[PDB]
């Protein structure tokens, strides 16, 4: 059962695994049909775009802080700042997210900017609009026309400015302050109250 110098393995095949095997023989067929569905859906509503406009959000988790991605929908405050009611925004290709909040300024500004760009490029037709102007427009890809752009990292040239305390010492002191904060402020009280 156990023999010569080999890695010890973990092959989980002790249940009736052969009753539950999924082979994606239909990978190409599903690609083609998913493509045909996109085609039909786009032809149904032309020239209106298929994709609603989406916000730009920071990814959570200290591993993904640096990145920014597409979110679910614009906040109520972001829409308020551009003068668009939430129930009206849904009828003009703008996504809405009542759950996301705007605690800071940067993301709010970026999404207000996206909304203003989209509103500047938007043309709402009405009963007066003729078929010849409706035929003038091509179905625009919204996620390509309003892409999520990573802010560029700082580069180039700048003056060198050396603080007297090292970065390493700053980090060590910050760790020490955090670590002993609770017991030091307990000592501060019990010494004070005894005064």
């Amino acid at each position: 059962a156990i023999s010569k110098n080999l890695p010890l393995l973990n092959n989980h095949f002790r249940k009736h695994w052969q009753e539950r095997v999924r082979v994606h023989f239909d990978q190409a067929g599903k690609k083609a049909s998913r493509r045909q569905s996109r085609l039909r859906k786009a032809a149904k509503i032309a020239p209106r775009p298929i994709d609603a406009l989406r916000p730009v959000v920071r990814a959570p988790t200290v591993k993904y802080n640096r990145k920014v991605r597409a979110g679910r929908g614009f906040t109520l405050a972001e829409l308020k700042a551009v003068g668009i009611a939430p129930k009206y925004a849904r009828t003009i290709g703008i996504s809405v997210d009542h759950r996301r909040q705007n605690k800071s300024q940067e993301t709010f500004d970026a999404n207000v900017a996206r909304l203003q760009e989209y509103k500047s490029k938007l043309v709402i037709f009405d009963k007066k609009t003729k078929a010849s102007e409706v035929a003038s427009f091509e179905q625009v890809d919204v996620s390509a026309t309003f892409p999520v752009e990573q802010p560029a990292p700082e580069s180039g040239l700048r003056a060198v400015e050396v603080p007297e305390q090292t970065a390493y010492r700053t980090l060590r002191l910050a760790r020490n302050e955090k670590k002993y904060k609770g017991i030091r402020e307990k000592r501060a009280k019990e010494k004070a109250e005894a005064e």
């Binding site: 539950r20 999924r22 082979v23 994606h24 023989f25 990978q27």
Partner: protein, 203 residues
């Protein structure tokens, strides 16, 4: 109105007034059939909160259900296997008494759809429930835009499939890390986690 007062009063189940009412009504319910039609809800505010309306086509049934656990129904207590499976007493049914009440009432009134249910009373032998029922075939239901949905055949015997409030409770259908196993259906999630997924170009 009065419904708020009834709501707050029904939360005082140990006051003298409520203890008296529960005693008298438990005796009365225990005198009638195990399943009987109720001419009206005994808790109209509670029934309203669960979807009842005082319209034609809304029906209330009462049922008592025997309390306690599930004795394993094996002859003479013999289970014929390993000691881990030898238990007969102290075993528990995985569905609640409320769901049993719903299912038995649904079996009796098979022309109707079970909407929801609520507790009404309790003694040491029985728990008493009232089951709210809707008639799919009544025009007062079929023409009502707030209740048309239950006419669709996908809601046939939703109480037998664990689709009522009590059923979705017992199935563990809730959001978050405490319901990882049952969130999307326990057996579906197990099947997904126990499926070997092979692609054409095997990585």
């Amino acid at each position: 109105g009065a419904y708020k007062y009834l709501e707050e009063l029904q939360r005082k189940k140990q006051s003298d007034v409520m203890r008296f009412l529960y005693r008298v009504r438990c005796w009365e319910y225990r005198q009638k059939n195990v399943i009987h039609r109720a001419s009206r809800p005994s808790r109209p505010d509670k029934a309203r909160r669960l979807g009842y309306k005082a319209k034609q086509g809304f029906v209330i049934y009462r049922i008592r259900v025997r309390r306690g656990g599930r004795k394993r129904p094996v002859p003479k207590g013999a289970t014929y296997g390993k000691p881990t499976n030898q238990g007969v007493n102290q075993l528990k049914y995985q569905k609640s008494l409320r769901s049993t009440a719903e299912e038995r009432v649904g079996r009796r009134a098979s022309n109707l759809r079970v909407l929801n249910s609520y507790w009404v009373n309790q003694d040491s032998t029985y728990k008493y429930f009232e089951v709210i029922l809707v008639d799919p075939s009544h025009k007062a239901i079929r023409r009502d835009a707030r209740y048309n949905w239950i006419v669709n055949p996908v809601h046939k015997h939703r109480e037998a499939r664990g689709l009522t409030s009590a059923g979705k409770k017992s199935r563990g259908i809730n959001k978050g890390h405490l319901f990882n196993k049952t969130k999307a259906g326990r057996r579906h999630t197990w099947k997904k986690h126990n499926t070997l997924s092979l692609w054409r170009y095997r990585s």
